[PDB]
A paper describes a structure:
DPP III (EC 3.4.14.4) is a cytosolic zinc-metallopeptidase which cleaves dipeptides from the N-termini of its substrates, consisting of three to ten amino acids. However, they enabled the recognition of five evolutionary conserved amino acid sequence regions in the M49 family, including the unique hexapeptide zinc-binding motif HEXXGH. Furthermore, this is the first functionally and structurally characterized member of this family with hexapeptide M49 signature motif reduced to the pentapeptide HEISH.
Author numbering: 32 to 476, 477A, 478 to 555
């Protein structure tokens, strides 16, 4: 268990205290108390025995149980999220429905209930209800009622925080989100969250991501981000959203493929994380999130893309830098910079909003996601990473970035390929990185030394290689070419021998990070 815990390097998550006066301190304190309740709620959402298992580990005298508790705390359950939820306590497999559904309820019984009781479909499929067996029936119990005890205390902490919040947009959001916990309707407070302006505390708290529900991907998990907004860095990102049409017109495709029906633009903010809780804190840590998922909000006001700068700093120092030291030639190692890591994530997120979407295939109105089917996510993340380099090169052309940043782009991404791929080559993001590495290696844009076991950028072919792969992925999307998407993945999204060799060199490094929050040492 000592080595499994070592996969997450302990790192201290600190924040700038000078950004908060006395009254903002009391906001963050009460926001922290509500976020710790999100830790308790989500722990119950993962598995019904989580609280009972935690209590057994707490009272146990076995020194081995205290090591199992440390990994339990990391994973919010007895299942190893780095290894397909393999239980490290006992051997009972994790329910596919976590704790949102009865463990003996299949998809068939669920779908058979909605056929016999059509009136329950809106409540049963809702992101904010749990399914339970009662009196020979299946009932949908809203989150506001199933977790009323926790959410009432969490709402009171939000109400107390709102009294100390002098920023009107912040005060309004905290008040409405407090009510949202109890009336189970998060739409009005989601809109207030998108309207946060001229504020320091960038905070989001509530149920959002549905990826814990591995039965239907229906139910959302409670989580929290408490971050501090950075005006100097968020200002530098205000011009990137002004280049959105320019980046699209500049894409390496015929004009008929270029998409100016992309929908509402997303606001983007660079923040310093103070505390995270719930779904996001389990296992691997988030570098940036994109909320809300409500299409009703994303149509009206878009979604907010929040970049966690200090989490990037932790991952760069603990992971990307040690990986680059082992995978790159010494002459290219200095080109690995924090700017190359953080600014790619910025442009990776921007690039998701570019490229084909609503398309016409054989005269029918359709979508890239509908046509690519299971290949869409791998192709989409491949597009975002390739365009992230392409558009950052475009930002150099326009004087936004200095010329010496060009080589940092290529090299830092190459080093980052082998941080992402260690998470798993079958995931969409890892699959997309496998394509980029194997394709650019084939083109000669990357080079693998079979004796030194190191990779490098070929600066004479890397620019065209990125353009070539961008053209190919964008064209596959614009034509809805599911067959070419499959063949691209079958050919290049593979664990090639160079990848196997480089991966073997990194077995002793941490996989991710364990957050040790300064605020937890302050408020305890
Ligand atoms: N996006 C993370 C890995 C996945 C985290 C999912 N919550 C990273 O690049 O470090
Ligand atoms: Cl504020
Ligand atoms: Na996580
Ligand atoms: Zn992505």
């Amino acid at each position: 268990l000592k080595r499994m815990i070592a996969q997450f390097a302990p790192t201290e998550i600190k924040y700038d205290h000078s950004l908060l006066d006395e009254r903002k301190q009391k906001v963050v304190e009460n926001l922290y108390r509500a976020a710790k309740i999100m830790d308790e709620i989500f722990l119950d959402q993962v598995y019904s025995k989580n609280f009972e298992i935690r209590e057994q580990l707490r009272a146990s005298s076995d020194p081995l149980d205290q090591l199992r508790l440390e990994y339990f705390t990391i994973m919010f359950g007895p299942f190893d999220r780095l290894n397909h939820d393999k239980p490290f306590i006992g051997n009972t497999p994790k329910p596919k429905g976590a704790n949102f559904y009865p463990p003996d309820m299949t998809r068939e019984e669920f779908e058979n209930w909605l056929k016999a009781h059509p009136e329950d479909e809106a409540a049963f499929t809702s992101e904010f209800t749990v399914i339970r067996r009662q009196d020979g029936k299946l009932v949908a119990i809203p989150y506001s009622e199933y977790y009323k005890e926790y959410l009432t205390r969490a709402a009171d902490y939000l109400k107390k925080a709102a009294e100390f919040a002098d920023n009107p947009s912040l005060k309004k959001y905290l008040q409405l989100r407090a009510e949202a916990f109890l009336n189970n309707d998060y739409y009005e407070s989601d809109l207030a969250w998108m309207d946060l302006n001229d504020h320091t505390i960038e905070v989001v708290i509530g149920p959002y991501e549905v990826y814990e529900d591995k039965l239907f991907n229906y139910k959302a998990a409670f989580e929290a981000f408490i971050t501090l907004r950075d005006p100097v860095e968020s200002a530098k990102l205000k011009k990137f959203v002004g280049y959105l049409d320019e980046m699209e017109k500049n894409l390496p495709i015929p004009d008929a493929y270029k998409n100016f029906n992309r929908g509402s633009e997303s606001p983007m903010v660079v923040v310093q994380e103070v505390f995270s809780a719930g779904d996001t804190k389990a296992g691997v840590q988030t570098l940036a999130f994109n909320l809300p998922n409500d299409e009703r909000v994303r149509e009206a006001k878009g979604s907010k893309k929040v970049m966690l700068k200090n989490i990037h700093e932790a991952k760069f120092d603990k992971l990307l830098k040690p990986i680059a030291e082992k995978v790159l030639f010494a002459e290219q190692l200095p080109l690995v910079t924090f700017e190359g890591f953080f600014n790619h994530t910025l442009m990776h997120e921007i690039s998701h909003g570019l490229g084909p979407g609503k398309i016409v295939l054989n005269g029918r109105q359709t979508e890239v996601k509908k046509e690519l089917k299971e290949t869409y996510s791998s192709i989409e993340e491949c597009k975002a990473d390739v365009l992230g380099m392409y558009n950052n090169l475009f930002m150099i052309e326009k004087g936004v970035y200095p010329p010496e940043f060009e080589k940092q782009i290529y090299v830092t991404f190459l080093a980052g390929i082998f941080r992402t791929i260690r998470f798993g080559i079958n995931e969409a993001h890892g699959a997309g990185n496998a394509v980029i590495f194997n394709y650019l290696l084939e083109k000669g844009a990357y080079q693998f030394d079979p004796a030194a076991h190191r990779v490098k950028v070929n600066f004479e072919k890397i620019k065209d290689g990125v353009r070539d792969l961008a053209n190919k992925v964008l064209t596959i999307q614009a034509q809805g070419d599911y067959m070419a998407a499959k063949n691209l993945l079958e050919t290049y999204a593979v664990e090639s021998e160079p990848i196997m060799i480089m991966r073997a060199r990194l077995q002793e490094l941490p996989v991710d990070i364990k957050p040790i929050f300064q605020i937890e040492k302050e408020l305890g």
